[PDB]
Design an enzyme around this catalytic site. Sequence first.
Site, PDB file in Angstrom:
ATOM      1  N   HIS B  88       0.834  -1.194   0.000  1.00 43.88           N
ATOM      2  CA  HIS B  88       0.000   0.000   0.000  1.00 43.88           C
ATOM      3  C   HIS B  88       0.873   1.251   0.000  1.00 43.88           C
ATOM      4  O   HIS B  88       2.100   1.181   0.087  1.00 43.88           O
ATOM      5  CB  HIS B  88      -0.968   0.000   1.195  1.00 43.88           C
ATOM      6  CG  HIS B  88      -1.815  -1.244   1.293  1.00 43.88           C
ATOM      7  ND1 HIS B  88      -2.952  -1.427   0.543  1.00 43.88           N
ATOM      8  CD2 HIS B  88      -1.651  -2.389   2.012  1.00 43.88           C
ATOM      9  CE1 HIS B  88      -3.476  -2.606   0.813  1.00 43.88           C
ATOM     10  NE2 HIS B  88      -2.700  -3.220   1.693  1.00 43.88           N
ATOM     11  N   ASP B  91      -1.688   8.624  -1.448  1.00 38.99           N
ATOM     12  CA  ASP B  91      -1.650   9.782  -2.339  1.00 38.99           C
ATOM     13  C   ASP B  91      -2.603  10.806  -1.689  1.00 38.99           C
ATOM     14  O   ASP B  91      -3.812  10.582  -1.577  1.00 38.99           O
ATOM     15  CB  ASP B  91      -2.134   9.329  -3.729  1.00 38.99           C
ATOM     16  CG  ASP B  91      -2.427  10.459  -4.706  1.00 38.99           C
ATOM     17  OD1 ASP B  91      -2.471  11.666  -4.341  1.00 38.99           O
ATOM     18  OD2 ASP B  91      -2.636  10.078  -5.898  1.00 38.99           O
ATOM     19  N   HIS B  93      -4.299  14.223  -2.164  1.00 33.55           N
ATOM     20  CA  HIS B  93      -4.613  15.282  -3.115  1.00 33.55           C
ATOM     21  C   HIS B  93      -4.278  16.680  -2.564  1.00 33.55           C
ATOM     22  O   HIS B  93      -4.191  17.638  -3.341  1.00 33.55           O
ATOM     23  CB  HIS B  93      -6.076  15.245  -3.572  1.00 33.55           C
ATOM     24  CG  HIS B  93      -6.427  14.081  -4.475  1.00 33.55           C
ATOM     25  ND1 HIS B  93      -7.643  13.998  -5.113  1.00 33.55           N
ATOM     26  CD2 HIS B  93      -5.727  12.983  -4.863  1.00 33.55           C
ATOM     27  CE1 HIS B  93      -7.682  12.909  -5.865  1.00 33.55           C
ATOM     28  NE2 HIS B  93      -6.550  12.245  -5.703  1.00 33.55           N
ATOM     29  N   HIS B 128      -6.035   8.705  -0.947  1.00 35.10           N
ATOM     30  CA  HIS B 128      -6.335   7.326  -1.272  1.00 35.10           C
ATOM     31  C   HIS B 128      -5.047   6.519  -1.503  1.00 35.10           C
ATOM     32  O   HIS B 128      -3.973   7.066  -1.791  1.00 35.10           O
ATOM     33  CB  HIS B 128      -7.258   7.244  -2.500  1.00 35.10           C
ATOM     34  CG  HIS B 128      -6.677   7.798  -3.761  1.00 35.10           C
ATOM     35  ND1 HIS B 128      -5.787   7.092  -4.535  1.00 35.10           N
ATOM     36  CD2 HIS B 128      -6.879   8.985  -4.405  1.00 35.10           C
ATOM     37  CE1 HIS B 128      -5.482   7.801  -5.617  1.00 35.10           C
ATOM     38  NE2 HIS B 128      -6.147   8.950  -5.572  1.00 35.10           N
ATOM     39  N   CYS B 129      -5.170   5.216  -1.418  1.00 34.20           N
ATOM     40  CA  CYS B 129      -4.038   4.351  -1.713  1.00 34.20           C
ATOM     41  C   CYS B 129      -3.728   4.427  -3.213  1.00 34.20           C
ATOM     42  O   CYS B 129      -4.619   4.615  -4.026  1.00 34.20           O
ATOM     43  CB  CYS B 129      -4.341   2.920  -1.254  1.00 34.20           C
ATOM     44  SG  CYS B 129      -2.920   1.854  -1.290  1.00 34.20           S
ATOM     45  N   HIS B 138      -7.372  -0.864  -5.446  1.00 35.41           N
ATOM     46  CA  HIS B 138      -7.215  -0.489  -4.050  1.00 35.41           C
ATOM     47  C   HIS B 138      -8.187   0.601  -3.651  1.00 35.41           C
ATOM     48  O   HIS B 138      -8.742   0.586  -2.560  1.00 35.41           O
ATOM     49  CB  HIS B 138      -5.779  -0.095  -3.769  1.00 35.41           C
ATOM     50  CG  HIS B 138      -4.864  -1.275  -3.641  1.00 35.41           C
ATOM     51  ND1 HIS B 138      -4.129  -1.529  -2.499  1.00 35.41           N
ATOM     52  CD2 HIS B 138      -4.596  -2.290  -4.500  1.00 35.41           C
ATOM     53  CE1 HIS B 138      -3.428  -2.643  -2.669  1.00 35.41           C
ATOM     54  NE2 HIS B 138      -3.678  -3.114  -3.887  1.00 35.41           N
ATOM     55  N   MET B 143     -10.043   2.074  -0.001  1.00 29.28           N
ATOM     56  CA  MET B 143      -8.922   2.857   0.536  1.00 29.28           C
ATOM     57  C   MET B 143      -8.960   4.324   0.111  1.00 29.28           C
ATOM     58  O   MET B 143      -8.175   4.779  -0.734  1.00 29.28           O
ATOM     59  CB  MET B 143      -7.613   2.219   0.146  1.00 29.28           C
ATOM     60  CG  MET B 143      -7.452   0.780   0.694  1.00 29.28           C
ATOM     61  SD  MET B 143      -5.751   0.187   0.697  1.00 29.28           S
ATOM     62  CE  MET B 143      -5.157   1.073   2.128  1.00 29.28           C
ATOM     63  N   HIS B 248     -27.674  15.467  -2.018  1.00 31.57           N
ATOM     64  CA  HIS B 248     -28.914  16.199  -1.785  1.00 31.57           C
ATOM     65  C   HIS B 248     -29.447  15.886  -0.400  1.00 31.57           C
ATOM     66  O   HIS B 248     -29.369  14.741   0.067  1.00 31.57           O
ATOM     67  CB  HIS B 248     -29.949  15.718  -2.807  1.00 31.57           C
ATOM     68  CG  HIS B 248     -31.333  16.238  -2.600  1.00 31.57           C
ATOM     69  ND1 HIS B 248     -31.772  17.415  -3.156  1.00 31.57           N
ATOM     70  CD2 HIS B 248     -32.401  15.707  -1.958  1.00 31.57           C
ATOM     71  CE1 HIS B 248     -33.035  17.610  -2.830  1.00 31.57           C
ATOM     72  NE2 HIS B 248     -33.449  16.578  -2.124  1.00 31.57           N
ATOM     73  N   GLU B 272     -30.056  22.820  -4.275  1.00 30.45           N
ATOM     74  CA  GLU B 272     -30.888  21.643  -4.061  1.00 30.45           C
ATOM     75  C   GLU B 272     -30.010  20.386  -4.090  1.00 30.45           C
ATOM     76  O   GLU B 272     -30.104  19.535  -3.200  1.00 30.45           O
ATOM     77  CB  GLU B 272     -32.021  21.568  -5.092  1.00 30.45           C
ATOM     78  CG  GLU B 272     -31.630  21.427  -6.563  1.00 30.45           C
ATOM     79  CD  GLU B 272     -32.825  21.631  -7.471  1.00 30.45           C
ATOM     80  OE1 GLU B 272     -33.864  20.956  -7.239  1.00 30.45           O
ATOM     81  OE2 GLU B 272     -32.710  22.442  -8.424  1.00 30.45           O
ATOM     82  N   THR B 273     -29.138  20.332  -5.090  1.00 36.60           N
ATOM     83  CA  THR B 273     -28.294  19.195  -5.327  1.00 36.60           C
ATOM     84  C   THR B 273     -26.970  19.765  -5.787  1.00 36.60           C
ATOM     85  O   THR B 273     -26.939  20.681  -6.624  1.00 36.60           O
ATOM     86  CB  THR B 273     -28.961  18.246  -6.370  1.00 36.60           C
ATOM     87  OG1 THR B 273     -30.248  17.793  -5.859  1.00 36.60           O
ATOM     88  CG2 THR B 273     -28.017  17.000  -6.706  1.00 36.60           C
ATOM     89  N   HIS B 299     -28.579  11.910  -5.601  1.00 37.48           N
ATOM     90  CA  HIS B 299     -29.821  12.115  -6.344  1.00 37.48           C
ATOM     91  C   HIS B 299     -29.865  11.575  -7.767  1.00 37.48           C
ATOM     92  O   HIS B 299     -30.696  11.992  -8.585  1.00 37.48           O
ATOM     93  CB  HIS B 299     -30.304  13.574  -6.274  1.00 37.48           C
ATOM     94  CG  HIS B 299     -31.802  13.709  -6.264  1.00 37.48           C
ATOM     95  ND1 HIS B 299     -32.588  13.306  -7.317  1.00 37.48           N
ATOM     96  CD2 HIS B 299     -32.651  14.214  -5.331  1.00 37.48           C
ATOM     97  CE1 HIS B 299     -33.857  13.552  -7.030  1.00 37.48           C
ATOM     98  NE2 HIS B 299     -33.922  14.104  -5.827  1.00 37.48           N
TER      99      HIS B 299
HETATM  100 CU    CU Z   1      -3.770  -0.127  -0.897  1.00 41.13          CU
HETATM  101 CU    CU Z   2      -6.148  10.598  -6.752  1.00 41.10          CU
HETATM  102 CU    CU Z   3     -35.578  14.931  -4.887  1.00 43.51          CU
END
Ligand code: CU
Ligand code: CU
Ligand code: CU
Lengths: 334, 334, 334
Positions: B88, B91, B93, B128-129, B138, B143, B248, B272-273, B299
């Site tokens: 593993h 990363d 971001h 994330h891995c 992964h 992950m 939502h 709303e969304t 949604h």
């Molecule tokens: Cu992993």
């Molecule tokens: Cu990424």
């Molecule tokens: Cu709705």
Amino acid sequence: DADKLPHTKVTLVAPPQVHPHEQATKSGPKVVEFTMTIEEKKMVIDDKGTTLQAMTFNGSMPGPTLVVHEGDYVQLTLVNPATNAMPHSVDFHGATGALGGAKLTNVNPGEQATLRFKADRSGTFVYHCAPEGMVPWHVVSGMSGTLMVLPRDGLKDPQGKPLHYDRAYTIGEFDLYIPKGPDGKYKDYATLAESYGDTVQVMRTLTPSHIVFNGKVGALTGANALTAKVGETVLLIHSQANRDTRPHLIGGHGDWVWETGKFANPPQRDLETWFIRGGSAGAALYTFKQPGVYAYLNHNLIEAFELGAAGHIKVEGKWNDDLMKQIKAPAPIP
Amino acid sequence: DADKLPHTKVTLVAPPQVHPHEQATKSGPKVVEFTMTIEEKKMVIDDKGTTLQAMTFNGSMPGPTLVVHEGDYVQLTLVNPATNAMPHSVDFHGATGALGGAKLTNVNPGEQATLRFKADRSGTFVYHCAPEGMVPWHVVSGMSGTLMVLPRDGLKDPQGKPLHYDRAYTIGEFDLYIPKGPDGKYKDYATLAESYGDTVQVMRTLTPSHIVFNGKVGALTGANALTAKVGETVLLIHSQANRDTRPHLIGGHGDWVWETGKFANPPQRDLETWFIRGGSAGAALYTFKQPGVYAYLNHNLIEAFELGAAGHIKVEGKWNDDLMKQIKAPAPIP
Amino acid sequence: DADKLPHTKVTLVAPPQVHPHEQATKSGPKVVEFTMTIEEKKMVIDDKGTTLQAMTFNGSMPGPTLVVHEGDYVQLTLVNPATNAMPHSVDFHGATGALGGAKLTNVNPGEQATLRFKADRSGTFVYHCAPEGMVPWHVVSGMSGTLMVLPRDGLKDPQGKPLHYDRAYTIGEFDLYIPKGPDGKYKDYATLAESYGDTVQVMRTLTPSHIVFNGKVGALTGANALTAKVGETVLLIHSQANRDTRPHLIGGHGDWVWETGKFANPPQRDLETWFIRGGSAGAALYTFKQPGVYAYLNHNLIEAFELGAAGHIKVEGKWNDDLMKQIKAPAPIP
Ligand SMILES: [Cu+2]
Ligand SMILES: [Cu+2]
Ligand SMILES: [Cu+2]
Ligand SMILES: [Cu+2]
Ligand SMILES: [Cu+2]
Ligand SMILES: [Cu+2]
Ligand SMILES: [Zn+2]
Ligand SMILES: [Zn+2]
Ligand SMILES: [Zn+2]
Ligand SMILES: [Zn+2]
Ligand SMILES: [Zn+2]
Ligand SMILES: [Zn+2]
């Protein structure tokens, strides 16, 4: 004015480069002349030799990026040689009227046409082929690229401060729909026309067989990786003429991003991942701060790693321990 | 500075809670130390006993949320116990360089590593891995989680006025790709490695078998519903490391939303969304005005109700007839 | 106030029109009364006679657009006639509390209910049916539309300058999931209930069989095309209650777009293609500058051309050679 204005002629270059151009300019409006010649051809799109019966502007996927300034007129000669089998046209999302120009650029094999339009709106805009009754097939087979219309005074941040890039790259992302035979292997077609019916069946499932940058899996890797250096600001232009994508730079960011690609709107900063709507081109600025090999990819990681929507950027320069440092290398647990 | 700065140690807590932290702070920059231990395990993901050969940070999907302030350094010890089968990495971001830290945190079973990076950009960011050649598997196996980097003076609205939350919740949404056998039933695998090939086949169809909040259908319902009260402002952090989603709140709104999750950008109001791009984390603020049981969901209602991407929030307090009133209860038509 | 306020009664009209209304208004807040009557019916949805066992508000897909101003109260009488087979309700995304009103509008066949809520947030908002345990089916079968809540002083641009439309159109886009039999032909069902199980199977694949504007392939074409003239500003309201879409006007633009549909946020300008999140309504303004027949479509071109998500707008007026001119018509290559 138009008919009064000076004309200039631009020589297009192959992706992923973009033809030399100014950002901020003291130049007034011009009629900027371009030519493109459609090429239909079979292309190998992955590492196991799958072919696509492809259709292209100027022989490449994507077509070349055309760069003008807001207020300029684009004047394109579109050439469809008699060696091609199909009619073509062009729809410029940057243009106003006549289905983007498509109704005025309907060219059969052995014909050409010349279209002029005013680039009265800044941004990155998709252009793509749009022949009556065959639009999605021509688009998914490769016929798209980007018109970039720069503000006459260059790019601006949300407070109106100047922004610039030192190098531009153009990435077109192509959702492909390659049919398979009863043996589960991809079909190879002797002609473009023979690929049609089977391809439409695949298209209607909405599931691409491949999703590739610039015409093939690994197009932007190895010898063909994008390059930059620490301290350099790159513009990444990303077009997707048919389907949504979500660009990301692994170990980087979108410092300033116009994900809807229209420069009169303020950009967003510090993005991890941005969103290009199918049927559009967006633009991201990033200034490299660390050397190394980055990935630039569609962050649906299946689409990127399994289907092909990923490239590399090899960056020169000096590592910065303030930004990132390995405090303890991998070693046995105490 | 870095090596000069004070250090603090944070104790992580399980989703959907987020470890105690300050928003606006008078504190200067710190090296903030975290530890996470990877656990591979089989998990039951739905109400009919389907299992996933899962991979996790700290035993949970999503991994825990790590909270620092802009200008802090994150210093993570990542531990991969010898009881795990796979290598593993992580990363982030939120980090700059070396594929998010992945190139510097490559840990085989029985190893650990310590990575430091500067959290120089505010927002919610996925981590994330990302082990070489096995990234999508992964990630889709569980992950991922969120790094939240708060501006040192707290959240701001578009006019620069202060915004705050009284309670934070973290929701990770997981598109799962569980294979089926010739009988149409989901496959159960004795080991993680045995699930691989069949899972990759499913992944490539781009169609999830399940889409779940926090590791299982109904994870955030019943006894495990989120809670709040009228007058309380909640932050809903929503991560999706692989695939787009559209959060939502039924009977509510996103009062202030950073759908791209980066706090130096102005939020939008009254949504709303909203939209979380695959490969990102976003953030919504809402202040409850009515008591009752709300749904918080993706949604695409198929994805929510059929595939699992839905949770509940039970809200205490006094009903408000000005906002909403049943004028005539259901009764026979006259 | 509420119980103190004046009441007005609005008569709804069929899509794609929107009932007459003011934008900026000197009127103070009102209780605005609406009525809708649910109709279940079989509808033909394509050019080869495929049917959908549909469910509708007021007999149309989408339901009609309801227009009020910020600060008004919406008071809806929802009528479910005894000639219908199913229970229904309504969830207004523009409302606060009780699952959008759904918990208070649960009407069995032969019942009606009256719900009031405060429209305290400006924007276009989806409303849709939301009966317990059957939400996605009722929504995908046709039960959605738009509540537009206009700011009391009308629409504003990012600098606070006034914006307006001269004509509004409402477009609801419907992802349909029509099952097929062993012969590969679409199934025709004698009753609504009989369509259910097979439809749910299709829904779970996440692949629509059809994606249609306003209830059928070609609904907004031919005699039923939208119309405008050069110099007229149209509002295009676009709802998608279940699935993402990406509207585009071929040969036009989104001059001002609220893609998340909430008018207290600044719009973006000059869009080529915008994005409506599944579970939301957005709004675009465009002022026509060229005459001709435009397409308005979902720019996943497969979804548009193969599956049905496309309409036409026929525009009267004088062609503008400054904006676009055919310099050389198609003719043989020299
Ligand atoms: Cu992993
Ligand atoms: Cu990424
Ligand atoms: Cu709705
Ligand atoms: Cu073509
Ligand atoms: Cu187009
Ligand atoms: Cu219903
Ligand atoms: Zn001239
Ligand atoms: Zn520079
Ligand atoms: Zn130290
Ligand atoms: Zn508070
Ligand atoms: Zn009254
Ligand atoms: Zn007007």
